[PDB]
């Protein structure tokens, strides 16, 4: 039906397999700290799996009028990210034993990032969609700022090493989302929805399963 | 108006009385641990009370097209369960001093269970509704698994005893929900909505007020 | 377009400036406890900023049929309060080192207060709107009760002093909301929407930025 269906189907399959792999791999783990990381990390692709399935079956898709056309908007992505992005930030924060204040700042700014992105995606006045994109981007920039300038002296080498790798993976991949949104169907519409869907699938799988494989294979998750 | 109104009214009344009873019973409690259990346990029927009232007044009801008919779907149940089921799991987890990793696993899987159940309840393609039911059921099975195989050596007798009772009550009652959904109006439609509503009221009151009476009368909630 | 636009624009500007001020003021803070208070306190007007902008641009506004008319209902307020009121209660609770049980009681009752207020705001049967208002008010009264009768012996003077001031500010300002709602467009409609919007803007800015200035200038936030 929809040309982007193949990418949604592949996304569903990859998130599903990733979830199952992490689920199996986490069996037997008794270390409290490691359990936290496995729980957070397995839940991420499990949620993504449900939302990709939602998009594939057509439930997480809605039509938004703007620019004089009926624009297909997959709102299920925000329902996904609303829960998965904060969880991913939690993995990074727990890894460096961040204090509660910083965790709340990250989670709250993340909520603002996704919430304003959702508002922008459903906004009927074309020009306003970009106002929301700008605010969401400012929130993302705040998050990236905190990750880099927001624990070193008393920090295990493996912890510092894995955190630096996951932080770099996060900054690169997350930074791409606003660009894809901006040039894709939710924004300027210069890149067709099918290609946009492919881009998000690669980004999502990398930011979730890729990110997860790196974290769960590290000894940093253990006390 | 709607034949199932009597069960919604009785459900509203029972949840309301249960809330008031727990509220009174919890007065004077100074023990920190006991306070946690009273807060969690009183909030559960208070939330259920609001959603049952929502259904009674008709606000938590919507019409979903599928199978060639306008099907009355009480979505308010998911708004209820989304918050009450995780809270109930929290009572069980705190009772056994479960570690954060396991708590997150339970809460996250519970969110998936209710979220996919909601998607299934509102899905317009009949066959797909059952795909969502299957995923939600898999999440429930994971939860039941964790409760039984997911703390013994260093565990007070009263704690182990009450937990085992509440765990058995939980497995039996919770396991009935997917069956009721499957044969009821949201699924195969072989059992009429009025009878389905009665079933859920008995299950809800038992899983909330019944469950609550057992927990709050035990000495396990005290340090 | 809408006469109340000026108050929404001023509200947007004030919440935005307040957010920026708190953001700057919180720079350099290394004290863990102080970080918690700055995070919570800065997030509050940041969220309010987004929802006021939502109302200004028209996204957070919907039409609800009741009383034989199309009533303009700004639902964005509840999306705001759903997150900001619990955060404000968290500031007060952390300030007095409240135990988890009491925190959950406050947060849960707050959720009920806002959730039932939202249901009332969107209810099509006029008389029922007031039933929801009554339940929401009962939840607010419970919260006010807990704040006054729910830690003294072992409590720093500055902490007790600032808490008492913020508690008084909270009881006075919060108590006004149900009155405004009752006499405003969501209720009896005796006070026009434009005036109602002005009232909420003054209350919101005072309960958020005013409240925030008092808290963040106190030494109580430091360990
Ligand atoms: C599993 C998914 C991940 C890690 C998704 C990350 C999403 C973002 C960083 C999204 C950010 C956006 C903006 C900064 C601007 C507005 C549009 C968004 C929501 C695509
Ligand atoms: C107070 C209510 C309780 C304890 C409700 C429990 C609800 C469930 C365990 C629901 C589970 C469902 C499935 C496993 C399959 C799909 C349909 C549901 C949501 C009814
Ligand atoms: C930043 C906003 C604040 C501090 C808002 C406070 C909101 C309330 C205390 C609202 C309470 C209401 C009731 C008690 C009755 C029903 C209507 C409401 C939601 C306006």
């Amino acid at each position: 039906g929809r040309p982007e269906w193949i990418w949604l189907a592949l996304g569903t399959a990859l998130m599903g397999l990733g979830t199952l792999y992490f689920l199996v791999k986490g069996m037997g783990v008794s270390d409290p700290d490691a359990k936290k990381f496995y729980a957070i990390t397995t839940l991420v692709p499990a949620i993504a799996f449900t939302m990709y399935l939602s998009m594939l079956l057509g439930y997480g898709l809605t039509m938004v009028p703007f620019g004089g056309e009926q624009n297909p908007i997959y709102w299920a992505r925000y329902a996904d990210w609303l829960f998965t992005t904060p969880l991913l930030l939690l993995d990074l924060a727990l890894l460096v034993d961040a204090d509660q204040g910083t965790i709340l700042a990250l989670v709250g700014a993340d909520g603002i990032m996704i919430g304003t992105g959702l508002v922008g995606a459903l906004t009927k006045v074309y020009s306003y969609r970009f106002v929301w994109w700008a605010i969401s981007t400012a929130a993302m920039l705040y998050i990236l700022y905190v990750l880099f300038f927001g624990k070193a002296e008393s920090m295990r080498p493996e912890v510092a090493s894995t955190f630096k790798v996951l932080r770099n993976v996060t900054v690169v991949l997350w930074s791409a989302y606003p660009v894809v949104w901006l040039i894709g169907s939710e924004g300027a519409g210069i890149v067709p929805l099918n290609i946009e869907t492919l881009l998000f699938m690669v980004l999502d799988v990398s930011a979730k399963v890729g990110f997860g494989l790196i974290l769960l294979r590290s000894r940093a998750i253990f006390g």
Side-chain angles (χ1 to χ4, degrees), chain A residues 22-40:
Chain A
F22 293 154
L23 194 63
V24 176
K25 195 179 184 306
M27 290 189 82
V29 177
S30 64
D31 180 62
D33 288 337
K35 279 183 176 180
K36 297 181 186 178
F37 286 110
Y38 268 99
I40 294 171

Side-chain angles (χ1 to χ4, degrees), chain A residues 44 78 80-81 84-85 88 113-114 117-118 132-133 136-137 140 174-175 177-178 181 200 204 207-208:
Chain A
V44 170
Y78 308 92
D80 175 335
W81 305 341
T84 59
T85 51
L88 285 166
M113 179 178 80
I114 304 301
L118 175 59
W132 292 112
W133 177 88
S136 180
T137 294
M140 184 190 74
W174 286 42
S175 292
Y177 287 77
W181 195 100
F200 278 139
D204 289 340
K208 293 185 166 67

Side-chain angles (χ1 to χ4, degrees), chain A residues 56-188:
Chain A
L56 178 66
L57 301 185
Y59 184 79
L61 171 65
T62 191
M63 297 298 127
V64 184
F66 73 72
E69 316 184 304
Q70 284 287 66
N71 303 286
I73 301 291
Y74 281 104
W75 61 265
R77 296 185 187 294
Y78 308 92
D80 175 335
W81 305 341
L82 177 66
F83 297 106
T84 59
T85 51
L87 286 174
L88 285 166
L89 291 178
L90 185 60
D91 262 340
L92 296 178
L94 291 186
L95 198 53
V96 302
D97 190 28
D99 38 53
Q100 307 185 307
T102 304
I103 292 174
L104 180 55
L106 282 169
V107 170
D110 191 283
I112 290 179
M113 179 178 80
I114 304 301
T116 54
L118 175 59
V119 172
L122 303 179
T123 288
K124 296 187 179 62
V125 184
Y126 193 64
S127 67
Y128 293 172
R129 298 174 69 77
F130 300 100
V131 171
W132 292 112
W133 177 88
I135 292 163
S136 180
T137 294
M140 184 190 74
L141 292 177
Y142 174 74
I143 296 173
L144 300 186
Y145 175 75
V146 174
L147 293 182
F148 283 112
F149 302 102
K151 296 297 174 299
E153 316 188 308
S154 61
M155 185 184 265
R156 295 154 54 183
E158 64 271 42
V159 170
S161 181
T162 296
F163 174 67
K164 295 183 71 63
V165 167
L166 293 176
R167 180 176 66 187
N168 286 320
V169 169
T170 297
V171 179
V172 176
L173 295 175
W174 286 42
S175 292
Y177 287 77
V179 178
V180 174
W181 195 100
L182 188 69
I183 64 181
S185 60
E186 290 86 8

